[PDB]
PDB file of C-alpha atoms in Angstrom:
ATOM      1  CA  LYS K 256       6.736  19.361   9.632  1.00  0.00           C
ATOM      2  CA  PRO K 257       7.390  21.846  12.443  1.00  0.00           C
ATOM      3  CA  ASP K 258       6.409  20.717  15.921  1.00  0.00           C
ATOM      4  CA  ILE K 259       6.540  21.950  19.511  1.00  0.00           C
ATOM      5  CA  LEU K 260       7.503  19.751  22.459  1.00  0.00           C
ATOM      6  CA  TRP K 261       7.522  20.459  26.181  1.00  0.00           C
ATOM      7  CA  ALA K 262      10.245  19.442  28.604  1.00  0.00           C
ATOM      8  CA  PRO K 263       9.518  15.999  30.120  1.00  0.00           C
ATOM      9  CA  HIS K 264      10.388  17.187  33.642  1.00  0.00           C
ATOM     10  CA  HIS K 265      10.232  21.004  33.350  1.00  0.00           C
ATOM     11  CA  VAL K 266       6.951  22.881  32.965  1.00  0.00           C
ATOM     12  CA  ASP K 267       8.546  26.134  31.738  1.00  0.00           C
ATOM     13  CA  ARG K 268      10.790  24.774  28.952  1.00  0.00           C
ATOM     14  CA  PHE K 269       9.748  24.095  25.363  1.00  0.00           C
ATOM     15  CA  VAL K 270      11.365  23.411  21.995  1.00  0.00           C
ATOM     16  CA  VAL K 271      10.175  24.343  18.496  1.00  0.00           C
ATOM     17  CA  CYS K 272      11.550  22.434  15.501  1.00  0.00           C
ATOM     18  CA  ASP K 273      12.204  24.143  12.155  1.00  0.00           C
ATOM     19  CA  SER K 274      15.188  24.700   9.878  1.00  0.00           C
ATOM     20  CA  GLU K 275      16.652  26.055  13.125  1.00  0.00           C
ATOM     21  CA  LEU K 276      15.626  24.461  16.430  1.00  0.00           C
ATOM     22  CA  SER K 277      14.717  26.985  19.132  1.00  0.00           C
ATOM     23  CA  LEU K 278      14.577  26.091  22.826  1.00  0.00           C
ATOM     24  CA  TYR K 279      12.605  28.685  24.794  1.00  0.00           C
ATOM     25  CA  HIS K 280      11.554  29.238  28.401  1.00  0.00           C
ATOM     26  CA  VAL K 281       8.271  30.622  29.744  1.00  0.00           C
ATOM     27  CA  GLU K 282       8.134  33.505  32.228  1.00  0.00           C
ATOM     28  CA  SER K 283       5.374  35.588  33.775  1.00  0.00           C
ATOM     29  CA  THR K 284       4.651  39.100  32.514  1.00  0.00           C
ATOM     30  CA  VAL K 285       1.462  40.102  34.369  1.00  0.00           C
ATOM     31  CA  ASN K 286       3.152  42.607  36.698  1.00  0.00           C
ATOM     32  CA  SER K 287       5.959  43.564  34.288  1.00  0.00           C
ATOM     33  CA  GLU K 288       6.082  45.235  30.893  1.00  0.00           C
ATOM     34  CA  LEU K 289       7.032  43.435  27.690  1.00  0.00           C
ATOM     35  CA  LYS K 290      10.615  42.296  28.203  1.00  0.00           C
ATOM     36  CA  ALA K 291      13.160  42.946  25.468  1.00  0.00           C
ATOM     37  CA  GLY K 292      13.332  39.993  23.099  1.00  0.00           C
ATOM     38  CA  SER K 293      10.505  38.178  24.906  1.00  0.00           C
ATOM     39  CA  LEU K 294       7.553  36.874  22.891  1.00  0.00           C
ATOM     40  CA  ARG K 295       4.145  37.625  24.412  1.00  0.00           C
ATOM     41  CA  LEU K 296       2.713  34.104  24.434  1.00  0.00           C
ATOM     42  CA  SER K 297      -0.449  35.376  26.145  1.00  0.00           C
ATOM     43  CA  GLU K 298      -1.724  38.588  27.731  1.00  0.00           C
ATOM     44  CA  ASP K 299       0.253  37.958  30.941  1.00  0.00           C
ATOM     45  CA  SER K 300       2.729  35.322  29.696  1.00  0.00           C
ATOM     46  CA  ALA K 301       6.179  35.873  28.190  1.00  0.00           C
ATOM     47  CA  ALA K 302       8.516  33.385  26.515  1.00  0.00           C
ATOM     48  CA  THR K 303      12.265  34.036  26.577  1.00  0.00           C
ATOM     49  CA  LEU K 304      14.471  32.285  24.033  1.00  0.00           C
ATOM     50  CA  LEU K 305      17.036  30.044  25.739  1.00  0.00           C
ATOM     51  CA  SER K 306      19.048  28.565  22.858  1.00  0.00           C
ATOM     52  CA  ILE K 307      19.139  28.349  19.070  1.00  0.00           C
ATOM     53  CA  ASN K 308      20.637  25.507  17.037  1.00  0.00           C
ATOM     54  CA  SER K 309      21.306  25.317  13.290  1.00  0.00           C
ATOM     55  CA  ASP K 310      23.160  21.980  13.489  1.00  0.00           C
ATOM     56  CA  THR K 311      20.380  19.903  11.827  1.00  0.00           C
ATOM     57  CA  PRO K 312      19.507  20.928   8.258  1.00  0.00           C
ATOM     58  CA  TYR K 313      16.570  19.161   6.648  1.00  0.00           C
ATOM     59  CA  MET K 314      15.380  17.687   9.937  1.00  0.00           C
ATOM     60  CA  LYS K 315      12.949  14.785   9.531  1.00  0.00           C
ATOM     61  CA  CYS K 316      12.200  13.207  12.929  1.00  0.00           C
ATOM     62  CA  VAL K 317      12.680  14.600  16.438  1.00  0.00           C
ATOM     63  CA  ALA K 318      12.544  12.988  19.883  1.00  0.00           C
ATOM     64  CA  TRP K 319      13.379  14.122  23.421  1.00  0.00           C
ATOM     65  CA  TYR K 320      15.311  12.115  26.005  1.00  0.00           C
ATOM     66  CA  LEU K 321      13.333  10.829  28.989  1.00  0.00           C
ATOM     67  CA  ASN K 322      15.932  10.864  31.770  1.00  0.00           C
ATOM     68  CA  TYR K 323      16.518  14.021  33.791  1.00  0.00           C
ATOM     69  CA  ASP K 324      20.265  14.158  33.090  1.00  0.00           C
ATOM     70  CA  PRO K 325      21.362  15.645  30.861  1.00  0.00           C
ATOM     71  CA  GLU K 326      18.800  18.428  30.450  1.00  0.00           C
ATOM     72  CA  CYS K 327      17.574  19.571  27.024  1.00  0.00           C
ATOM     73  CA  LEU K 328      18.702  16.398  25.240  1.00  0.00           C
ATOM     74  CA  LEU K 329      17.152  15.495  21.890  1.00  0.00           C
ATOM     75  CA  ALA K 330      17.671  13.048  19.035  1.00  0.00           C
ATOM     76  CA  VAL K 331      17.194  14.166  15.429  1.00  0.00           C
ATOM     77  CA  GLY K 332      16.984  11.801  12.465  1.00  0.00           C
ATOM     78  CA  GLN K 333      17.653  13.363   9.079  1.00  0.00           C
ATOM     79  CA  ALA K 334      16.614  12.531   5.522  1.00  0.00           C
ATOM     80  CA  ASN K 335      19.899  10.707   4.870  1.00  0.00           C
ATOM     81  CA  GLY K 336      19.087   8.432   7.826  1.00  0.00           C
ATOM     82  CA  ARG K 337      21.705   9.738  10.252  1.00  0.00           C
ATOM     83  CA  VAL K 338      20.337  10.076  13.790  1.00  0.00           C
ATOM     84  CA  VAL K 339      22.326  12.518  15.925  1.00  0.00           C
ATOM     85  CA  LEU K 340      21.971  13.123  19.659  1.00  0.00           C
ATOM     86  CA  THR K 341      22.214  16.843  20.426  1.00  0.00           C
ATOM     87  CA  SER K 342      21.969  18.975  23.554  1.00  0.00           C
ATOM     88  CA  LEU K 343      20.806  22.549  24.065  1.00  0.00           C
ATOM     89  CA  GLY K 344      21.152  23.136  27.811  1.00  0.00           C
ATOM     90  CA  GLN K 345      24.030  24.931  29.514  1.00  0.00           C
ATOM     91  CA  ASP K 346      25.457  21.682  30.887  1.00  0.00           C
ATOM     92  CA  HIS K 347      29.069  22.115  32.000  1.00  0.00           C
ATOM     93  CA  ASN K 348      28.894  18.872  34.037  1.00  0.00           C
ATOM     94  CA  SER K 349      27.612  16.312  31.535  1.00  0.00           C
ATOM     95  CA  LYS K 350      27.456  12.862  33.119  1.00  0.00           C
ATOM     96  CA  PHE K 351      28.528  11.045  29.924  1.00  0.00           C
ATOM     97  CA  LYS K 352      29.771  13.439  27.240  1.00  0.00           C
ATOM     98  CA  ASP K 353      30.635  10.462  25.010  1.00  0.00           C
ATOM     99  CA  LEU K 354      26.951  10.237  24.066  1.00  0.00           C
ATOM    100  CA  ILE K 355      26.898  13.972  23.277  1.00  0.00           C
ATOM    101  CA  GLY K 356      27.000  14.268  19.499  1.00  0.00           C
ATOM    102  CA  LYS K 357      26.686  10.499  19.061  1.00  0.00           C
ATOM    103  CA  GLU K 358      25.430   9.610  15.586  1.00  0.00           C
ATOM    104  CA  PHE K 359      23.969   6.395  14.190  1.00  0.00           C
ATOM    105  CA  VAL K 360      24.222   5.902  10.420  1.00  0.00           C
ATOM    106  CA  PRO K 361      22.088   3.296   8.610  1.00  0.00           C
ATOM    107  CA  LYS K 362      23.858   0.519   6.742  1.00  0.00           C
ATOM    108  CA  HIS K 363      21.860   1.483   3.638  1.00  0.00           C
ATOM    109  CA  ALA K 364      20.992   5.116   2.965  1.00  0.00           C
ATOM    110  CA  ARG K 365      17.278   5.500   3.692  1.00  0.00           C
ATOM    111  CA  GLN K 366      15.011   8.110   5.248  1.00  0.00           C
ATOM    112  CA  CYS K 367      14.114   7.696   8.921  1.00  0.00           C
ATOM    113  CA  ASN K 368      10.347   7.996   9.309  1.00  0.00           C
ATOM    114  CA  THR K 369       9.971   8.019  13.103  1.00  0.00           C
ATOM    115  CA  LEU K 370      12.075   7.845  16.255  1.00  0.00           C
ATOM    116  CA  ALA K 371      11.107   7.258  19.879  1.00  0.00           C
ATOM    117  CA  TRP K 372      12.611   6.400  23.256  1.00  0.00           C
ATOM    118  CA  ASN K 373      11.628   3.482  25.475  1.00  0.00           C
ATOM    119  CA  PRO K 374       9.804   4.779  28.582  1.00  0.00           C
ATOM    120  CA  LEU K 375      10.788   1.898  30.875  1.00  0.00           C
ATOM    121  CA  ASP K 376      14.459   2.071  29.817  1.00  0.00           C
ATOM    122  CA  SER K 377      15.700   5.486  28.691  1.00  0.00           C
ATOM    123  CA  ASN K 378      18.763   3.861  27.062  1.00  0.00           C
ATOM    124  CA  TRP K 379      16.703   2.198  24.291  1.00  0.00           C
ATOM    125  CA  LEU K 380      15.826   4.058  21.087  1.00  0.00           C
ATOM    126  CA  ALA K 381      13.505   2.631  18.429  1.00  0.00           C
ATOM    127  CA  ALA K 382      13.661   4.156  14.946  1.00  0.00           C
ATOM    128  CA  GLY K 383      11.595   3.220  11.902  1.00  0.00           C
ATOM    129  CA  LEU K 384      13.062   4.179   8.544  1.00  0.00           C
ATOM    130  CA  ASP K 385      12.224   3.902   4.852  1.00  0.00           C
ATOM    131  CA  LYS K 386      11.591   0.560   3.162  1.00  0.00           C
ATOM    132  CA  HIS K 387      14.866  -0.984   2.020  1.00  0.00           C
ATOM    133  CA  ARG K 388      15.038  -3.628  -0.699  1.00  0.00           C
ATOM    134  CA  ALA K 389      15.954  -6.545   1.589  1.00  0.00           C
ATOM    135  CA  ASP K 390      16.774  -4.930   4.944  1.00  0.00           C
ATOM    136  CA  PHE K 391      15.033  -4.387   8.266  1.00  0.00           C
ATOM    137  CA  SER K 392      12.997  -1.205   8.669  1.00  0.00           C
ATOM    138  CA  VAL K 393      12.800  -0.873  12.479  1.00  0.00           C
ATOM    139  CA  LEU K 394      16.028  -0.690  14.483  1.00  0.00           C
ATOM    140  CA  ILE K 395      16.330  -0.615  18.273  1.00  0.00           C
TER     141      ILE K 395
ATOM    142  CA  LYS C 595      43.321  21.877   8.108  1.00  0.00           C
ATOM    143  CA  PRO C 596      42.775  21.814  11.877  1.00  0.00           C
ATOM    144  CA  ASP C 597      43.843  24.919  13.762  1.00  0.00           C
ATOM    145  CA  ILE C 598      43.829  26.309  17.297  1.00  0.00           C
ATOM    146  CA  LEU C 599      42.928  29.905  18.141  1.00  0.00           C
ATOM    147  CA  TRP C 600      43.024  31.779  21.433  1.00  0.00           C
ATOM    148  CA  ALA C 601      40.360  34.154  22.695  1.00  0.00           C
ATOM    149  CA  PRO C 602      41.094  37.750  21.594  1.00  0.00           C
ATOM    150  CA  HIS C 603      40.339  39.138  25.069  1.00  0.00           C
ATOM    151  CA  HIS C 604      40.527  36.041  27.317  1.00  0.00           C
ATOM    152  CA  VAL C 605      43.815  34.329  28.148  1.00  0.00           C
ATOM    153  CA  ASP C 606      42.220  31.074  29.369  1.00  0.00           C
ATOM    154  CA  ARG C 607      39.883  30.326  26.432  1.00  0.00           C
ATOM    155  CA  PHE C 608      40.813  28.505  23.232  1.00  0.00           C
ATOM    156  CA  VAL C 609      39.093  26.858  20.273  1.00  0.00           C
ATOM    157  CA  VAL C 610      40.192  23.868  18.181  1.00  0.00           C
ATOM    158  CA  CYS C 611      38.711  23.394  14.704  1.00  0.00           C
ATOM    159  CA  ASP C 612      37.980  19.930  13.285  1.00  0.00           C
ATOM    160  CA  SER C 613      34.937  18.061  12.000  1.00  0.00           C
ATOM    161  CA  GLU C 614      33.582  19.150  15.391  1.00  0.00           C
ATOM    162  CA  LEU C 615      34.685  22.496  16.843  1.00  0.00           C
ATOM    163  CA  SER C 616      35.698  22.317  20.508  1.00  0.00           C
ATOM    164  CA  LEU C 617      35.934  25.391  22.735  1.00  0.00           C
ATOM    165  CA  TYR C 618      37.990  24.673  25.857  1.00  0.00           C
ATOM    166  CA  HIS C 619      39.150  26.579  28.930  1.00  0.00           C
ATOM    167  CA  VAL C 620      42.485  26.362  30.754  1.00  0.00           C
ATOM    168  CA  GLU C 621      42.724  25.777  34.509  1.00  0.00           C
ATOM    169  CA  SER C 622      45.548  25.164  36.958  1.00  0.00           C
ATOM    170  CA  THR C 623      46.273  21.666  38.254  1.00  0.00           C
ATOM    171  CA  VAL C 624      49.523  22.071  40.224  1.00  0.00           C
ATOM    172  CA  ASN C 625      47.928  21.693  43.669  1.00  0.00           C
ATOM    173  CA  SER C 626      45.064  19.432  42.536  1.00  0.00           C
ATOM    174  CA  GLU C 627      44.860  15.959  41.041  1.00  0.00           C
ATOM    175  CA  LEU C 628      43.800  15.263  37.464  1.00  0.00           C
ATOM    176  CA  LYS C 629      40.221  16.500  37.219  1.00  0.00           C
ATOM    177  CA  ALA C 630      37.606  14.259  35.633  1.00  0.00           C
ATOM    178  CA  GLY C 631      37.334  14.973  31.921  1.00  0.00           C
ATOM    179  CA  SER C 632      40.193  17.497  32.038  1.00  0.00           C
ATOM    180  CA  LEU C 633      43.071  17.151  29.574  1.00  0.00           C
ATOM    181  CA  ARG C 634      46.529  17.529  31.121  1.00  0.00           C
ATOM    182  CA  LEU C 635      47.924  20.209  28.813  1.00  0.00           C
ATOM    183  CA  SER C 636      51.148  20.317  30.848  1.00  0.00           C
ATOM    184  CA  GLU C 637      52.502  18.887  34.101  1.00  0.00           C
ATOM    185  CA  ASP C 638      50.611  21.468  36.191  1.00  0.00           C
ATOM    186  CA  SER C 639      48.073  22.694  33.606  1.00  0.00           C
ATOM    187  CA  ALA C 640      44.587  21.335  32.917  1.00  0.00           C
ATOM    188  CA  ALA C 641      42.177  22.167  30.097  1.00  0.00           C
ATOM    189  CA  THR C 642      38.437  21.752  30.673  1.00  0.00           C
ATOM    190  CA  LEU C 643      36.141  21.458  27.666  1.00  0.00           C
ATOM    191  CA  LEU C 644      33.603  24.298  27.585  1.00  0.00           C
ATOM    192  CA  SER C 645      31.493  23.576  24.491  1.00  0.00           C
ATOM    193  CA  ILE C 646      31.291  21.286  21.473  1.00  0.00           C
ATOM    194  CA  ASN C 647      29.705  22.147  18.127  1.00  0.00           C
ATOM    195  CA  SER C 648      28.927  19.869  15.172  1.00  0.00           C
ATOM    196  CA  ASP C 649      27.044  22.557  13.212  1.00  0.00           C
ATOM    197  CA  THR C 650      29.753  23.032  10.522  1.00  0.00           C
ATOM    198  CA  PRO C 651      30.533  19.928   8.447  1.00  0.00           C
ATOM    199  CA  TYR C 652      33.404  20.198   5.992  1.00  0.00           C
ATOM    200  CA  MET C 653      34.673  23.440   7.503  1.00  0.00           C
TER     201      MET C 653
END
């Protein structure tokens, strides 16, 4: 199920989820001609692709980090149940690179249905997965 | 089989291949202390990680 999400703190940044995840930026095109490689979102609006990522095949659930740093940070839960934290911004000064690429694997292989971040505390992630035989379905 | 490759046209850029592929850059550290997150390649050499990629499992 493809979906589009805006940046929590940036009004010009968006992400579209598919077999490849595309992070794009919005620019004005009223006084300028159609830029090369820019998608005419509207009559006077242009969207320029910022990054492309093919690191998540068969993506199931997608969420975006709440905190400002790092920028363009998302969490993707796959069909196998692995939830991987990825980044798409040009961040050469990541505050904590140890969390970059961090993956959580379920004890029992099951499909993750939904994933979300806690608004009050950005360090808490709640994920609901498929129904196991005798195991918990929601993990925080 | 992990391997390291240099940039064909850049002398300061290298790539290391593993389960995650890491592209790093080389900087001097003779007159400066150990930079945060920089790997001391030599006594006076420092390598700063440029990018990390997990897009190729079982490379």
